[PDB]
Design a protein around this motif. Structure first.
Motif, PDB file in Angstrom:
ATOM      1  N   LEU A 178       0.564  -1.227  -0.118  1.00 27.48           N
ATOM      2  CA  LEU A 178       0.025  -0.235   0.125  1.00 27.48           C
ATOM      3  C   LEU A 178       0.855   1.319   0.136  1.00 27.48           C
ATOM      4  O   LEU A 178       0.210   2.447  -0.368  1.00 27.48           O
ATOM      5  N   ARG A 204      -5.252  -5.865   2.491  1.00 24.61           N
ATOM      6  CA  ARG A 204      -5.703  -6.237   1.057  1.00 24.61           C
ATOM      7  C   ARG A 204      -6.667  -7.611   1.449  1.00 24.61           C
ATOM      8  O   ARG A 204      -7.312  -7.830   0.557  1.00 24.61           O
ATOM      9  N   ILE A 213      -8.874  -3.141  -1.441  1.00 27.10           N
ATOM     10  CA  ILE A 213      -8.051  -2.166  -0.185  1.00 27.10           C
ATOM     11  C   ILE A 213      -9.022  -2.041   0.577  1.00 27.10           C
ATOM     12  O   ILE A 213     -10.276  -1.555   0.540  1.00 27.10           O
TER      13      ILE A 213
END
Lengths: 216, 216
Positions: free
Chosen positions: A12, A58, A181
Motif C-alpha cells: 500500500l 488487502r 483495499i
C-alpha cells in the motif's frame, strides 16, 4: 500527548496511503502518529489488543471484534519482460487463463495470509491453479527477476510506481482480476481521530476522482 | 546442463543488474542461471564454499580467498517529502552536513553489513554521526514513510526507479557521497561463464556511456 497507531501492508506504500497519512498529519500537528508494517492477521490481533487503532490491508480476516470497510477495488496487472509474447498485448490486455503455463513469481514470503495468498485466490476463483509458481521474498525481488528474464508476476496497479528497464505492465481483462483495499478498526470504534483519518481518505479519494468510501 | 549461481543485494535490482543478467541469459540459452538474494558477508561465505560463482554487492568484505572488482561509483541521493525545506535545493543539491539534525531512515534490517552500514560509514567518513536515526525493514518502507512525512532517507541514485507522490530526490554535493558497486569472485576464478558475465557488464556499461570496468 495522544498517540494513534496505524498498521499497514507494504504493498500500500506505492499508492495513496502515504499522502493520506501526510494530510492526516497536517490536520493534527500535536498528534504522535506511529506507523507499523504488519499483515492483516497481525493487524487483527493488534486491534483487539489495542496495539493499533486502524489497519490498512488487502485480505479479509474473519473476526466478530473487527469492523472492515472496503475502500476501493484496485486492478491487478501482469509484470513481464518487454520481449515476452504477452507484451504484444500491452494495449489490448490479457486474461488470467493466458498465464496458466507461465513461470509466475509470487511475493512476499512474510506471515500468511499475504499478497501471494490473494493472487492464488484470484486464480482459484477463476478455476485456475498455476503449477510453475515460485514465492520470492519481496515485490522488488519479483519485479527485478522479471526484468532479469526469470518469469512473470502479478501486481497491484499502484506498483507501477516502480519502473525498471525492460519491465512492462500488462492490464488484465478479467473483470474480477482485482485487489481490494480495506480499512479495519475495532467493532465499536468511535474515536474522533479515527473518524478524522477516514475523512482524510474521503478527501484524497474525491480529489483523485475515485468513488468516495461509504459514510462513517 | 551447467549451472551458474549468482548472488546479489536487493538494492542492485533497481539499476543495471537485471538487464545484464538478461543479456547474459541470451548468450547462453542452454545455461541454468540461479539468482540468490544475499548480503556481501553471505556472498563471501557462499563463494568460498562453491555455493555461488559471482556476487554483486556494495560493501567490501576482507578475505584473501575472494577477488573483488570495483565496477562503478554510484551517487547517493537524499529522499525527501516535496514540502521539506531541503527540496528547495533540488536543483542546487545539499551537503551531508545539512542532514545531521534530520530524522533519517536507514534500511534494510537484514544481516550486517548492509546498505545501512554503508550510509553510516559515509557519514562517519565526513566527521558526522546523526543521532535521529531509525532503521526500517526495506527500501520501500523507507521511501513510503518519507512520503508519509516521517523523515528523510539516503538512497543510491538508481533507487529513483521508485517514484511516489510527493517524494523527491535531492542530489548530494559531497564528492565522496557515493555508493560503489562490486563484483566478487573466487581468487583463482577462471571459468569462461564468469568471464562471459564480466564481458556482458562491459557491453552494457559501454552502451550506457559509463567507464568500462577494468580488463579481465
Amino acid at each position: 500527548e495522544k498517540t494513534i497507531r496505524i498498521g499497514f501492508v507494504g504493498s500500500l506504500l506505492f499508492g495513496l496511503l502515504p499522502r493520506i497519512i501526510h494530510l492526516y498529519r497536517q490536520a493534527h500537528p500535536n498528534l504522535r502518529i506511529e506507523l507499523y508494517e504488519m499483515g492483516t492477521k497481525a493487524q487483527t490481533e493488534a486491534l483487539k489488543e489495542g496495539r493499533i487503532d486502524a489497519g490498512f490491508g488487502r485480505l479479509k480476516i474473519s473476526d466478530p471484534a473487527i469492523k472492515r470497510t472496503l475502500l476501493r477495488n484496485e486492478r491487478l496487472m501482469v509484470a513481464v519482460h518487454a520481449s515476452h509474447p504477452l507484451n504484444q498485448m500491452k494495449d489490448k490486455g490479457v486474461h488470467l487463463n493466458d498465464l496458466i503455463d507461465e513461470k509466475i513469481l509470487l511475493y512476499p514470503s512474510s506471515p500468511k495470509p499475504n499478497f501471494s495468498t490473494h493472487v492464488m485466490n484470484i486464480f482459484s476463483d477463476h478455476g485456475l491453479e498455476p503449477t510453475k509458481i515460485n514465492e520470492v521474498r519481496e515485490v522488488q525481488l519479483a519485479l527485478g527477476l522479471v526484468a532479469a528474464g526469470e518469469g512473470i508476476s502479478l501486481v497491484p496497479a499502484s506498483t507501477q510506481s516502480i519502473q525498471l528497464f525492460n519491465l512492462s505492465y500488462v492490464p488484465l481483462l478479467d473483470p474480477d482480476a482485482i485487489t481490494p483495499i480495506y480499512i479495519a478498526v475495532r467493532n465499536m470504534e468511535e474515536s474522533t481521530y479515527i473518524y478524522s483519518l477516514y475523512e482524510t481518505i474521503r478527501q484524497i479519494y474525491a480529489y483523485e476522482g475515485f468513488t468516495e468510501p461509504p459514510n462513517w
